Design a protein around this ligand. Structure first.
Ligand SMILES: CC(CO)(CO)NC(=O)Nc1ccccc1
Ligand SMILES: CC(CO)(CO)NC(=O)Nc1ccccc1
Length: 284
């Protein structure tokens, strides 16, 4: 029974290695990683791989690993797939812990833009969780944390993290992680998966997929939002992504908005993440 070596980048930046039978479905590997992580609330997470075009793809747990990674290495990342709109409602602290690690990467990466003050507040909760109560012994006027807090670090940001850290004395890791999440969840790009597209006129837009629905970012002024209760249906055909929108009350016919994606695989990928978000967040 022939087994393939799998390497998984975990959210703390470490590598987990295991073997699975070469015809294994993605669920097999996912269950191994979640068991390793002592994670029970698995529904919010998934594994990603990089395709031959270097795009992030979700490993479908129902399909053979080999028919997804195809010619590529059996190398994966463990990630949050469905960002909960209300992390306080997760049943376990360890779930909230992995969600914090994902969000810290979302922030450092620049995927999740954040004000100076929110970067410092989020950083101060991470420090409280990881080091516990503020200690001046590991902090002179020239302190710079090992912790990555932001896409670009400044001495002013380091200083503000420490000032807020001082205010958190007695806070437990679970408490600091909950505070991190109560702040992070309000950011306008929290749990937004962004896809480059062109509108029907050929203007470059971004399409966002999240818990609430679909967002079209035309520019900083003019963002169209389609709550899942407003989207009737979605479709991909060749390079084309189409969204069908319900009519307003006392109007006969749904409207269609068409988008042009880079290639057929990018159209399919957007369609699949939309269907998955719609299913998940219809039910949740
Ligand atoms: C105005 C508000 C606060 O955000 C009231 O709850 N709802 C939304 O903005 N919903 C939404 C729809 C589609 C995509 C993203 C968000
Ligand atoms: C089976 C299929 C696949 O596309 C076609 O009807 N379902 C959807 O598209 N469901 C959907 C509904 C509202 C919002 C987003 C997706």
């Amino acid at each position: 029974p022939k087994s393939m070596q799998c390497k998984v980048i975990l959210l703390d930046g470490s590598e987990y290695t295991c073997d699975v039978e070469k015809r294994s479905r993605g669920q097999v590997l996912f269950d191994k990683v979640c068991e390793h992580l002592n994670l029970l609330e698995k529904d919010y997470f998934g594994l990603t791989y990089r395709d031959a075009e270097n795009q992030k793809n979700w490993l479908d747990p129902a399909k053979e690993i080999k028919k997804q990674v195809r010619s590529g290495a059996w190398h994966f990342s463990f990630n949050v797939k469905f960002y909960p709109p209300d992390p306080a409602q997760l049943s376990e602290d360890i779930t909230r812990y992995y969600l914090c690690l994902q969000l810290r990467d979302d922030i450092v990466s620049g995927r999740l833009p954040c004000s100076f003050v929110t970067l410092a507040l989020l950083g101060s909760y991470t420090v409280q969780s990881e080091l516990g109560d503020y200690d001046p012994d590991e902090c002179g006027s020239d302190y710079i944390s090992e912790f990555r807090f932001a896409p670009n670090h400044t001495k002013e940001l380091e200083d503000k993290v420490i000032e807020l850290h001082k205010s958190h004395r007695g806070m437990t890791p679970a408490e600091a992680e909950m505070h991190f999440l109560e702040n992070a969840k309000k950011l306008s790009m929290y749990g937004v998966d962004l896809h480059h597209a062109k509108d029907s006129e050929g203007v470059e837009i971004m399409l966002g997929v999240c818990a609430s629905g679909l967002l079209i970012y035309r520019d900083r002024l003019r963002i169209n939002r389609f709550a899942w209760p407003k989207v009737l249906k979605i479709s991909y055909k060749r390079n084309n992504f189409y969204i069908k929108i319900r009519p307003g009350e006392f109007e006969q016919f749904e409207s269609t908005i068409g988008f042009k994606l880079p290639n057929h695989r990018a159209a399919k990928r957007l369609w699949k993440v939309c269907v998955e978000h719609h299913t998940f967040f219809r039910l949740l």
